[PDB]
C-alpha cells in the first residue's frame, strides 16, 4: 500500500528485467573508452606485458564523424486542412530554445553512446529565466544523460523503440558532495540527510573508487478523464480550457474579464508526475511536471526483443572477441622478442681458455683462435660449432593474428553507411518533437492566428501570477525530420536557396533572388543591397 | 565446477540513532593545535534576592562550559593479494561491507554512550507484557520526568525500544478487543505509533545494549562532600584551566561491583525544578562514568545541592538536588536485574563530532587516497590504497574519524523494565 513500496517494486522489476543488456552495454563503454584488458587479477599480480593495438576505434571514430556531418532536428509541418502557417510560432520557439550549446552537446553525447554501447538518451527540462525567456518567463532546455544504459531504467512492459508506452521511468543521479548540496538547495531537500540509492556504476577494475551520492527521479504517467470548461471568448469563438489549469487562480477572473461559461465537458488526457526517491524514503511525492509525456528521449542502435528480453547493440559488441585475441597474440609476440636468448656460439670453456678477450665483441684482431689440445684427452674432439637459434614468431601466432584482425575488420562494418542509425536518431527526434510540443502547450504562451493577426488570451490572478490560456486547437502541426538550423531566418534562407536551385531562369528566378536579398544579414553594403531588393519587391506589387 | 556470482544477501541493518544524532565538524586547524577538543558554554542561570537593602550583597557572574572531543580512527585495513580469481569481486564486496560495518560501529557506540551516560532512569518492577497499556505508561513516565525537570526539548525528543518490548507493546495494542485506527495499524503492521505519550519520535532499535545487574551492595557515602559549579580553576603553575561541568568525583565506602553504566541514587536526595528550584517527589538518579581508585567514582550529573551553605549564590543558581551528601547515605543501585535497555533523549543531547584525515596531501605520495562517503550515518572517511611490488601485493584501508559526545547527560535517559528483586 505504501507509495514507497509501489515505486520500489516497479523499479526492482525493471532493474532485474534489464540486467543482461545493461551489463553488456557497460562492458562496451568500458571496452571502447578506458581499456580492452577487462581484467584485474592478472594485471595486478605477476605483471606481464599487455599491449593495446586498436583496430575498432578508427571504425568508431569514422562512424561518429559520419553521424556528425549530417545533423538532424525536429521540423514542424502544418496538419491537413489547417492554415498553411500553423507551425511557424512553434517552430520559432523550438529554434529559439534549442539553439544553445547544451542541446547540441546532449544530442552528440547520445549519438556517440548509441554508436558505442547501443543506447543513449537525453532529457527535456523546464526552467525559469528572467533575462532572456523563450516565453512566459520560462525556457525549455535539453540536458545530457551519461551512460544511459545504466542510469536510465525504463518501464519493463514497453515494446517501442522510442518508449512512448512506458508508464514510468527512473533516472539515477550520481553527484559529488557539492553537487548534492546544490541539488538539495534547488529542490528544497535536506542537505544534511545524505541520500542513498542503488549505485548504477560499478567502478570495477579498481580505478580507485567513486566518491558520489545517488538519488533517483521517478517519472510516472497517468491518463485519466478530467474536467474542461467551454467558455465564450469575448473576441470571437468558443475556447476550451482545462479545469485543473485554472482551478483556483483565475476561475473567477475569466468571468471578470468577460468570459461566460457555456458548457462543461470531460476530456481524457495524460499527466506526468516526478518523485524524488531514495532507497529508504520518498522526498518529493508526486510533483506534477509540464507535458503529457515523460521528458526522457532514448536513442537506440540495433534494438529488438528476443524472448520478452530487450537487446540493443552498437558496433563494439561483436568486435570484442577478435580484438581481445589480437591484443593477446601481439602481447605474446612481444614477450617472445624480449625474453629470449639470442644467437651466440656454444663453446666448451677449454676451447677458448686464454682467448676469451677475442670473442667479447671487439674488432682488434684479424681472426679467432681456438685451443687444440688437452693434456689427458690428447686432442679436442671434433664437432661443428653450434649457435643458439634465432627468435621466431610461430606460424600459429602469425596466422592467428592475421585471422583475428581480418575477422575484426569484417565484422566492424555498420551496414554497407549509417542510414539505420540515423533513422533511429530520426525516430528519437520525432519523439523529442512530440514531447516539446506538449510542454510548449503546457507552459508557453501560444498565440492564435486569426484571418480577420496573432492574439494572446491571458490574464493575471490576484497574486500577480499570469495564468496562460491555451485553447484545445493546439495540435495543429505534426513532426517531420529536417536539417538543423539555428534560426527561422536561416531556415527561410535555406528554403529560398532550394527553390532557386530548381527554378529556371525566368521571372520567378528574379523574384527568388530578390527574396534572398531581402532575407539577408545586415552590414553597410549588404544593407544597401537589401534595401534595393525591398524597393524592387514593393514596386512590382 | 559451475558457478554464478549473484550475491546471496544475508544482512539488512538499519541506523536510526546515528541518523538522528546531529553531526558536528569544527575547524581542523583549530582542533589540531587545540588537541581535538572544543568547549561550549552552558545556558546561564540567575540568582534572585528579595529585599530593599542589598548593600554588599551584589552577586557575580558564572557561566559554565562543557567539552567535546574525539577518539581514534576506526579502520578496515585489509591486504590485497593474488589468491584466487574471485578476489577482485570480493574486493568490491569487501569495500561495501566495510562501509556498512563502519556505519554499524558508529551506531553501536552512539547507543552505548547514550545508555551509559543517561542520567534519568525509569525503572519498572515488572515486564512490559504484564499489565495493560504499560508500554504507554513507560513512555509517559519518560516524558513526565523530562517535563518535571523543566529540561529543554525544543529541537525534539526520541524514544527507542528494543524489539522485544516493541513487540510486547504491539501485543498490548492488538489484544484490545476493539479495532479503531491505532489497533488496526498495530495489527496489519507491527508499528504502535510514530508518536506515543508525548514523544514526537518513537522507534525501535536492534542495537540497544543490555545493562547487566550490578552485584554492588552495602555502599555508603564516605565523608560529607559538596560539589560546586565552577567554570575554571588554577593549575599548579597558576594558569586557569577549564572545568567540564557534567562530572563529579564522589568518595564511597567501597567501589566493589560497580562499573561504567551503573545507575545509582543516594538515599534522601531529590530532584529539583532547575529553573524554579522546587523540590520534586522523585529521587535523584545518577550514572557512573568511570571507577577511579577503589573508593572513588565519577557520576555524570554533578550533584549541586540547594541547601549547601558553602556555595556562592551564583553557584547555588545552578542547583539541581535539594540535599548534599552526608557521610552515611546509602547508595541505592537502580539496576538489579539484567535487562535490555529502552533509551530516550532530547534530540540535541548526543552529537557526533567529526574530523577529516588529510591523507590526500602531497606528503603522502605513492598511496592513492579518496574521500569515502558513508550512507545512513552522515559521515565521511578516507579510502587509501598502496601497492607494494616488494611482495607484489597491496594494502587497502578505509579510515573514519569521529567521536560521540553527550553534552547534556541529564537529558538522556534509560528505561529498565522488570527490575524486581
Coordinates of N, CA, C and O in Angstrom, one line a residue, chain B residues 104-245:
Chain B
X104 N 27.6 0.6 11.1 CA 27.1 -0.1 12.3 C 27.9 0.3 13.5 O 27.3 0.4 14.6
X105 N 29.2 0.4 13.4 CA 30.0 0.8 14.6 C 29.7 2.1 15.1 O 29.6 2.3 16.4
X106 N 29.5 3.1 14.3 CA 29.0 4.4 14.7 C 27.7 4.3 15.5 O 27.6 4.9 16.6
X107 N 26.8 3.6 15.0 CA 25.5 3.4 15.7 C 25.8 2.7 17.1 O 25.1 3.1 18.1
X108 N 26.6 1.7 17.1 CA 26.7 0.9 18.3 C 27.3 1.8 19.4 O 26.9 1.8 20.6
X109 N 28.3 2.6 19.1 CA 28.9 3.5 20.1 C 27.9 4.6 20.5 O 27.9 5.1 21.6
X110 N 27.1 5.1 19.5 CA 26.1 6.1 19.9 C 25.1 5.5 20.9 O 24.9 6.1 22.0
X111 N 24.6 4.3 20.7 CA 23.7 3.7 21.6 C 24.3 3.4 22.9 O 23.7 3.6 24.0
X112 N 25.5 2.9 22.9 CA 26.2 2.6 24.2 C 26.5 3.8 25.0 O 26.3 3.8 26.2
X113 N 27.0 4.9 24.3 CA 27.2 6.1 25.0 C 25.9 6.7 25.6 O 25.9 7.2 26.8
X114 N 24.8 6.7 24.9 CA 23.6 7.1 25.5 C 23.2 6.3 26.7 O 22.8 6.8 27.7
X115 N 23.3 4.9 26.5 CA 22.8 4.1 27.6 C 23.7 4.1 28.8 O 23.3 3.7 29.9
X116 N 25.0 4.5 28.7 CA 25.9 4.5 29.8 C 26.1 5.9 30.4 O 26.7 6.0 31.4
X117 N 25.7 7.0 29.7 CA 25.7 8.3 30.2 C 24.4 8.9 30.5 O 24.2 10.0 30.9
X118 N 23.3 8.1 30.3 CA 22.0 8.6 30.5 C 21.7 8.7 32.0 O 21.6 7.7 32.7
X119 N 21.5 9.9 32.5 CA 21.3 10.1 33.9 C 19.9 9.7 34.4 O 19.7 9.0 35.4
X120 N 18.8 10.0 33.6 CA 17.5 9.7 34.0 C 17.2 8.2 33.8 O 17.5 7.7 32.8
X121 N 16.7 7.6 34.9 CA 16.4 6.2 34.9 C 15.0 5.9 35.2 O 14.5 6.4 36.3
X122 N 14.3 5.2 34.4 CA 12.8 4.9 34.6 C 12.7 3.4 34.7 O 12.7 2.7 33.8
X123 N 12.6 3.0 36.0 CA 12.6 1.6 36.3 C 11.1 1.1 36.4 O 10.2 2.0 36.8
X124 N 10.9 -0.1 36.2 CA 9.6 -0.8 36.5 C 9.8 -2.1 37.2 O 10.8 -2.7 37.1
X125 N 8.9 -2.4 38.1 CA 9.0 -3.7 38.9 C 8.6 -4.9 38.1 O 8.7 -6.0 38.7
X126 N 8.1 -4.8 36.9 CA 7.6 -5.9 36.2 C 7.9 -5.7 34.7 O 8.3 -4.6 34.3
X127 N 7.7 -6.7 33.9 CA 8.0 -6.6 32.5 C 7.0 -5.7 31.8 O 6.1 -5.2 32.4
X128 N 7.1 -5.6 30.5 CA 6.1 -4.8 29.7 C 4.9 -5.5 29.3 O 3.8 -4.9 29.0
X129 N 4.9 -6.9 29.2 CA 3.7 -7.6 28.8 C 2.8 -7.9 30.0 O 1.8 -8.7 29.7
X130 N 3.0 -7.4 31.2 CA 2.2 -7.9 32.3 C 0.9 -7.1 32.5 O -0.2 -7.7 32.5
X131 N 1.0 -5.8 32.6 CA -0.3 -5.0 32.7 C -0.6 -4.4 31.4 O 0.1 -4.4 30.4
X132 N -1.9 -3.9 31.3 CA -2.4 -3.3 30.1 C -1.9 -1.8 30.0 O -1.9 -1.1 31.0
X133 N -1.6 -1.4 28.8 CA -1.1 0.0 28.5 C 0.1 0.3 29.2 O 0.4 1.5 29.4
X134 N 0.9 -0.6 29.7 CA 2.1 -0.3 30.5 C 3.3 0.1 29.6 O 4.2 0.8 30.1
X135 N 3.3 -0.2 28.3 CA 4.2 0.4 27.4 C 4.0 1.9 27.3 O 4.9 2.7 27.3
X136 N 2.7 2.3 27.2 CA 2.4 3.7 27.2 C 2.7 4.3 28.6 O 3.2 5.4 28.6
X137 N 2.5 3.6 29.6 CA 2.9 4.1 31.0 C 4.4 4.3 31.0 O 4.8 5.3 31.6
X138 N 5.2 3.5 30.4 CA 6.6 3.6 30.4 C 7.1 4.8 29.6 O 7.9 5.7 30.1
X139 N 6.5 5.0 28.4 CA 6.9 6.2 27.6 C 6.4 7.4 28.3 O 7.1 8.5 28.3
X140 N 5.2 7.4 28.9 CA 4.7 8.6 29.6 C 5.5 8.9 30.8 O 5.7 10.1 31.2
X141 N 6.1 7.9 31.5 CA 7.0 8.2 32.7 C 8.2 8.9 32.2 O 8.7 9.8 32.8
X142 N 8.7 8.4 31.0 CA 9.9 9.1 30.5 C 9.6 10.6 30.2 O 10.3 11.5 30.6
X143 N 8.4 10.8 29.5 CA 8.0 12.2 29.1 C 7.8 13.1 30.4 O 8.2 14.2 30.4
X144 N 7.2 12.5 31.4 CA 6.9 13.2 32.6 C 8.2 13.6 33.4 O 8.3 14.7 34.0
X145 N 9.2 12.7 33.4 CA 10.4 13.0 34.1 C 11.2 14.1 33.3 O 11.9 14.9 33.9
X146 N 11.1 14.1 32.0 CA 11.7 15.2 31.2 C 10.9 16.5 31.5 O 11.5 17.6 31.5
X147 N 9.6 16.4 31.6 CA 8.8 17.7 31.8 C 9.0 18.3 33.2 O 9.1 19.5 33.3
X148 N 9.0 17.5 34.2 CA 9.1 18.0 35.6 C 10.4 18.7 35.8 O 10.4 19.7 36.5
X149 N 11.5 18.2 35.2 CA 12.8 18.8 35.4 C 12.9 20.1 34.6 O 13.9 20.8 34.8
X150 N 11.9 20.5 33.8 CA 12.0 21.7 33.0 C 13.2 21.6 32.1 O 13.8 22.7 31.9
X151 N 13.5 20.4 31.5 CA 14.5 20.3 30.5 C 14.1 20.8 29.2 O 12.9 20.8 28.8
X152 N 15.0 21.2 28.4 CA 14.8 21.8 27.0 C 14.5 20.6 26.1 O 15.4 19.7 25.9
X153 N 13.4 20.7 25.4 CA 13.1 19.7 24.4 C 12.6 20.4 23.1 O 11.6 19.9 22.4
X154 N 13.2 21.5 22.8 CA 12.7 22.3 21.6 C 13.0 21.6 20.3 O 12.1 21.5 19.4
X155 N 14.2 21.1 20.1 CA 14.5 20.5 18.8 C 14.0 19.1 18.7 O 14.1 18.5 17.6
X156 N 13.5 18.5 19.8 CA 12.8 17.3 19.6 C 13.1 16.3 20.8 O 13.9 16.6 21.6
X157 N 12.4 15.2 20.7 CA 12.6 14.1 21.7 C 12.5 12.8 21.0 O 11.8 12.7 20.0
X158 N 13.1 11.7 21.6 CA 13.1 10.4 20.9 C 13.1 9.3 21.9 O 13.7 9.5 23.0
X159 N 12.4 8.2 21.6 CA 12.3 7.1 22.4 C 12.5 5.8 21.6 O 11.7 5.5 20.8
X160 N 13.6 5.1 21.9 CA 13.9 3.9 21.1 C 13.6 2.7 22.0 O 14.1 2.6 23.2
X161 N 12.8 1.8 21.5 CA 12.5 0.5 22.1 C 13.5 -0.6 21.6 O 14.0 -0.5 20.5
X162 N 13.6 -1.6 22.4 CA 14.3 -2.8 21.8 C 13.2 -3.7 21.2 O 12.0 -3.6 21.6
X163 N 13.5 -4.5 20.2 CA 12.5 -5.3 19.5 C 11.6 -6.1 20.4 O 10.4 -6.2 20.1
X164 N 12.1 -6.7 21.5 CA 11.2 -7.5 22.4 C 10.1 -6.6 22.9 O 8.9 -7.0 22.9
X165 N 10.5 -5.5 23.5 CA 9.5 -4.6 24.1 C 8.6 -3.9 23.1 O 7.4 -3.6 23.4
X166 N 9.1 -3.6 21.9 CA 8.3 -3.1 20.8 C 7.2 -4.1 20.5 O 6.0 -3.8 20.3
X167 N 7.6 -5.4 20.4 CA 6.6 -6.5 20.1 C 5.6 -6.6 21.2 O 4.4 -6.8 21.0
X168 N 6.0 -6.5 22.5 CA 5.1 -6.5 23.6 C 4.1 -5.4 23.6 O 2.9 -5.5 24.0
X169 N 4.6 -4.2 23.3 CA 3.7 -3.0 23.1 C 2.7 -3.2 22.0 O 1.5 -2.9 22.2
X170 N 3.1 -3.7 20.9 CA 2.2 -4.0 19.8 C 1.2 -5.1 20.2 O 0.0 -5.0 19.8
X171 N 1.6 -6.1 21.0 CA 0.7 -7.1 21.5 C -0.4 -6.5 22.4 O -1.6 -6.8 22.4
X172 N 0.1 -5.6 23.3 CA -0.8 -4.9 24.2 C -1.9 -4.1 23.4 O -3.1 -4.1 23.7
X173 N -1.4 -3.5 22.2 CA -2.4 -2.8 21.4 C -3.4 -3.7 20.7 O -4.5 -3.4 20.6
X174 N -2.9 -4.9 20.2 CA -3.7 -5.7 19.4 C -4.6 -6.6 20.2 O -5.6 -7.2 19.7
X175 N -4.4 -6.8 21.5 CA -5.2 -7.6 22.4 C -6.4 -6.8 23.0 O -7.0 -7.2 23.9
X176 N -6.7 -5.7 22.3 CA -7.6 -4.7 23.0 C -9.1 -5.0 22.8 O -9.9 -4.3 23.4
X177 N -9.5 -6.0 22.0 CA -10.9 -6.4 21.8 C -11.6 -5.3 21.1 O -12.9 -5.2 21.3
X178 N -11.0 -4.4 20.4 CA -11.6 -3.3 19.7 C -10.6 -2.8 18.6 O -9.4 -2.7 18.9
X179 N -11.1 -2.5 17.4 CA -10.3 -2.0 16.3 C -10.8 -0.7 15.9 O -12.0 -0.5 15.5
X180 N -9.9 0.3 16.1 CA -10.2 1.7 15.6 C -9.3 2.0 14.4 O -9.4 1.6 13.3
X181 N -8.2 2.8 14.7 CA -7.2 3.1 13.8 C -5.8 2.6 14.3 O -5.0 2.0 13.6
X182 N -5.5 3.0 15.6 CA -4.3 2.5 16.2 C -4.2 1.0 16.3 O -3.2 0.4 15.9
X183 N -5.3 0.3 16.8 CA -5.2 -1.1 16.8 C -5.1 -1.8 15.5 O -4.5 -2.8 15.3
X184 N -5.8 -1.2 14.5 CA -5.7 -1.7 13.1 C -4.3 -1.6 12.5 O -3.8 -2.5 11.9
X185 N -3.7 -0.4 12.8 CA -2.3 -0.3 12.3 C -1.4 -1.3 13.1 O -0.5 -1.9 12.4
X186 N -1.5 -1.4 14.4 CA -0.7 -2.3 15.1 C -1.0 -3.8 14.8 O -0.2 -4.6 15.1
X187 N -2.1 -4.0 14.1 CA -2.4 -5.4 13.7 C -1.8 -5.7 12.3 O -1.0 -6.6 12.2
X188 N -2.2 -4.9 11.3 CA -1.6 -5.1 10.0 C -0.1 -4.9 10.0 O 0.6 -5.8 9.5
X189 N 0.4 -3.8 10.5 CA 1.8 -3.6 10.7 C 2.2 -3.8 12.1 O 1.3 -3.8 13.0
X190 N 3.5 -3.9 12.4 CA 3.8 -4.0 13.8 C 3.9 -2.7 14.6 O 4.0 -2.7 15.8
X191 N 3.8 -1.6 13.8 CA 4.0 -0.3 14.4 C 3.0 0.1 15.4 O 1.8 0.0 15.1
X192 N 3.4 0.5 16.6 CA 2.4 1.0 17.6 C 1.9 2.4 17.1 O 0.7 2.5 16.8
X193 N 2.8 3.4 17.1 CA 2.5 4.7 16.6 C 3.8 5.4 16.5 O 4.8 5.1 17.1
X194 N 3.8 6.5 15.6 CA 5.0 7.3 15.5 C 5.3 8.2 16.6 O 6.4 8.5 16.9
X195 N 4.2 8.6 17.3 CA 4.3 9.5 18.5 C 3.4 8.9 19.6 O 2.3 8.7 19.3
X196 N 4.0 8.6 20.7 CA 3.3 8.0 21.8 C 3.6 8.8 23.1 O 4.8 9.1 23.4
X197 N 2.6 9.1 23.9 CA 2.6 9.6 25.2 C 3.4 10.9 25.2 O 3.9 11.3 26.3
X198 N 3.5 11.6 24.1 CA 4.2 12.9 24.1 C 5.4 13.0 23.3 O 5.6 14.0 22.6
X199 N 6.2 11.9 23.3 CA 7.4 11.9 22.4 C 7.0 12.0 21.0 O 6.1 11.4 20.5
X200 N 7.8 12.8 20.2 CA 7.5 13.1 18.9 C 8.2 12.2 17.9 O 8.2 12.4 16.7
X201 N 9.0 11.2 18.4 CA 9.6 10.2 17.6 C 9.9 9.0 18.4 O 10.8 8.9 19.2
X202 N 9.1 7.9 18.2 CA 9.2 6.7 18.9 C 9.6 5.6 17.9 O 8.8 5.4 16.9
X203 N 10.7 4.9 18.1 CA 11.2 4.0 17.2 C 11.6 2.7 17.9 O 11.4 2.6 19.1
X204 N 12.1 1.7 17.2 CA 12.7 0.6 17.7 C 14.1 0.4 17.2 O 14.4 0.8 16.0
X205 N 15.1 0.0 18.0 CA 16.5 -0.1 17.6 C 16.9 -1.5 17.9 O 16.7 -2.0 19.1
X206 N 17.6 -2.2 17.0 CA 18.1 -3.6 17.3 C 19.4 -3.6 18.0 O 19.9 -4.7 18.3
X207 N 20.1 -2.5 18.1 CA 21.5 -2.4 18.6 C 21.5 -1.8 20.0 O 22.6 -1.4 20.5
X208 N 20.4 -1.7 20.7 CA 20.3 -1.3 22.1 C 21.0 -2.3 23.0 O 20.8 -3.5 22.8
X209 N 21.9 -1.8 23.9 CA 22.6 -2.8 24.7 C 21.8 -3.4 25.8 O 20.6 -3.2 25.9
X210 N 22.4 -4.3 26.6 CA 21.8 -4.9 27.7 C 22.6 -4.5 29.0 O 23.8 -4.7 29.0
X211 N 21.9 -3.9 29.9 CA 22.5 -3.4 31.1 C 22.5 -4.4 32.2 O 21.5 -4.7 32.8
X212 N 23.7 -5.1 32.4 CA 23.8 -6.1 33.4 C 23.6 -5.6 34.8 O 23.9 -4.5 35.1
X213 N 23.0 -6.5 35.6 CA 22.8 -6.1 37.0 C 24.1 -5.9 37.7 O 25.2 -6.5 37.4
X214 N 24.1 -5.0 38.7 CA 25.3 -4.8 39.5 C 25.2 -5.4 40.8 O 24.2 -5.2 41.5
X215 N 26.2 -6.3 41.1 CA 26.2 -7.0 42.4 C 26.6 -6.1 43.6 O 26.5 -6.6 44.7
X216 N 26.9 -4.9 43.3 CA 27.3 -4.0 44.4 C 26.2 -3.8 45.4 O 25.0 -3.6 45.0
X217 N 26.5 -3.8 46.7 CA 25.5 -3.6 47.7 C 26.2 -3.2 49.0 O 27.4 -3.4 49.2
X218 N 25.5 -2.6 49.9 CA 26.0 -2.1 51.2 C 27.1 -1.0 51.0 O 28.1 -1.0 51.7
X219 N 26.8 0.0 50.1 CA 27.8 1.0 49.8 C 27.2 2.3 50.3 O 26.0 2.7 49.9
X220 N 28.0 3.1 51.1 CA 27.5 4.3 51.6 C 28.5 5.4 51.3 O 29.7 5.2 51.1
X221 N 28.0 6.6 51.2 CA 28.9 7.8 51.0 C 29.9 7.9 52.2 O 29.5 7.8 53.3
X222 N 31.2 8.1 51.8 CA 32.2 8.2 52.8 C 32.6 9.7 52.9 O 33.3 10.2 52.0
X223 N 32.2 10.4 54.0 CA 32.6 11.7 54.2 C 31.6 12.7 53.5 O 31.2 12.5 52.4
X224 N 31.2 13.7 54.2 CA 30.3 14.7 53.6 C 31.1 15.5 52.6 O 32.1 16.1 52.8
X225 N 30.5 15.6 51.4 CA 31.1 16.2 50.2 C 30.2 17.2 49.6 O 28.9 17.0 49.6
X226 N 30.7 18.3 49.1 CA 30.0 19.3 48.4 C 30.6 19.6 47.0 O 31.8 19.9 47.0
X227 N 29.8 19.6 46.0 CA 30.3 19.8 44.6 C 29.8 21.1 44.1 O 28.6 21.4 44.2
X228 N 30.7 21.9 43.6 CA 30.4 23.3 43.3 C 30.5 23.6 41.8 O 31.4 23.2 41.2
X229 N 29.5 24.3 41.3 CA 29.6 24.7 39.9 C 30.7 25.7 39.6 O 30.7 26.9 40.1
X230 N 31.7 25.3 38.9 CA 32.9 26.2 38.6 C 33.0 26.2 37.1 O 32.6 25.3 36.3
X231 N 33.7 27.3 36.6 CA 34.0 27.5 35.2 C 35.4 27.3 34.8 O 35.7 26.9 33.7
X232 N 36.3 27.5 35.8 CA 37.7 27.2 35.6 C 38.4 27.1 37.0 O 37.8 27.5 38.0
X233 N 39.6 26.6 37.0 CA 40.4 26.6 38.2 C 41.8 26.7 37.9 O 42.3 26.3 36.8
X234 N 42.6 27.0 38.9 CA 44.1 27.2 38.7 C 44.8 25.9 38.8 O 44.5 25.1 39.7
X235 N 45.7 25.7 37.9 CA 46.6 24.6 38.0 C 47.8 24.9 38.9 O 47.8 26.0 39.5
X236 N 48.8 24.1 38.9 CA 49.9 24.3 39.8 C 50.8 25.5 39.4 O 51.4 26.2 40.2
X237 N 50.7 25.8 38.1 CA 51.5 27.0 37.6 C 50.7 28.3 37.6 O 51.3 29.3 37.2
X238 N 49.5 28.3 38.1 CA 48.7 29.5 38.1 C 47.8 29.7 36.9 O 47.0 30.6 36.9
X239 N 48.0 28.9 35.9 CA 47.2 29.0 34.7 C 45.8 28.5 35.0 O 45.6 27.5 35.6
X240 N 44.8 29.3 34.5 CA 43.4 29.0 34.7 C 43.0 28.0 33.6 O 42.9 28.4 32.4
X241 N 42.7 26.8 34.0 CA 42.3 25.7 33.0 C 40.8 25.5 33.3 O 40.3 25.6 34.4
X242 N 40.1 25.1 32.2 CA 38.6 25.0 32.2 C 38.2 23.7 32.9 O 39.0 22.7 33.0
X243 N 37.0 23.7 33.4 CA 36.4 22.5 34.1 C 35.2 22.1 33.4 O 34.2 22.8 33.2
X244 N 35.2 20.8 33.0 CA 33.9 20.2 32.5 C 32.9 20.1 33.5 O 33.2 19.7 34.7
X245 N 31.6 20.3 33.2 CA 30.6 20.5 34.1 C 29.7 19.3 34.4 O 29.0 19.3 35.4

